[PDB]
Amino acid sequence: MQIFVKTLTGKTITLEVEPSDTIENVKAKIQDKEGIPPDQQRLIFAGKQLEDGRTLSDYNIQKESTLHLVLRL
Amino acid sequence: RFVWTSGLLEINETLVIQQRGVRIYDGEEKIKFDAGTLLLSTHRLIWRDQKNHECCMAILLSQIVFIEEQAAGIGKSAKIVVHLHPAPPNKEPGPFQSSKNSYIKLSFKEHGQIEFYRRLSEEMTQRRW
Numbered sequence: 001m002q003i004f005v006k007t008l009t010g011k012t013i014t015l016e017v018e019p020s021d022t023i024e025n026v027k028a029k030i031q032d033k034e035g036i037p038p039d040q041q042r043l044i045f046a047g048k049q050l051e052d053g054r055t056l057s058d059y060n061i062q063k064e065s066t067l068h069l070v071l072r073l
Numbered sequence: 074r075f076v077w078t079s080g081l082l083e084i085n086e087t088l089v090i091q092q093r094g095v096r097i098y099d100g101e102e103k104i105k106f107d108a109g110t111l112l113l114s115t116h117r118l119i120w121r122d123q124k125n126h127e128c129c130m131a132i133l134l135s136q137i138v139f140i141e142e143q144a145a146g147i148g149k150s151a152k153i154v155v156h157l158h159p160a161p162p163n164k165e166p167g168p169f170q171s172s173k174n175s176y177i178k179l180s181f182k183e184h185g186q187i188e189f190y191r192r193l194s195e196e197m198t199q200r201r202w
Contacts, residue, residue, distance in 0.1 A: 008138065008156065008157075008158070008159055008170075008175040009159065009170045009171055010159045010161065010170065042139070044138065044139050047139075047197045047198055047200070048198075049139070068138050068139070070138055070139045070156050073141075073143060073154065
């Protein structure tokens with residue numbers, strides 16, 4: 001399953017995930033593909049920040065959905 | 074990121090909250106700049122300078138990615154930090170957008186930040202536009 005992450009450079013990142021993947025684990029994949037350390041990442045879907053412990057299904061994030069990365073200040 | 078506006082509200086646009094005494098900083102600045110009345114409507118955040126001139130300036134709420142509060146230390150009241158979706162383009166310049174930073178900061182010099190932060194949150198959640 002492919003999901004997208006838009007960052008504020010305008011770049012779209014494509015990730016390979018399954019609905020059972022925790023947000024922690026998604027953040028790890030971003031560090032793999034982009035170099036950004038998990039601890040500076042924040043992930044937004046709908047308009048609300050996503051919790052580390054929980055899953056993509058828990059938030060109902062399906063095939064082709066878009067999260068938004070926003071770094072910590 | 075801000076565009077000119079007359080200040081009037083469009084047909085199905087309602088005023089939610091307004092506040093005097095708000096300054097808008099750019100990214101990590103700490104003296105630019107502006108000082109004035111902030112309006113939140115159902116569709117837009119509108120700024121309007123103290124004694125006019127000019128202004129008004131507004132951004133669409135759909136342009137807001139995320140918001141958060143940031144402490145002033147042992148002061149009185151937090152800054153609201155607003156993260157904006159980027160523009161584009163349009164081919165040629167460019168240069169690199171990574172060395173530019175992409176949020177604005179609202180400071181509330183005459184208070185009312187908590188109330189504003191709450192209203193902004195609810196407008197972000199409800200997306201009434």
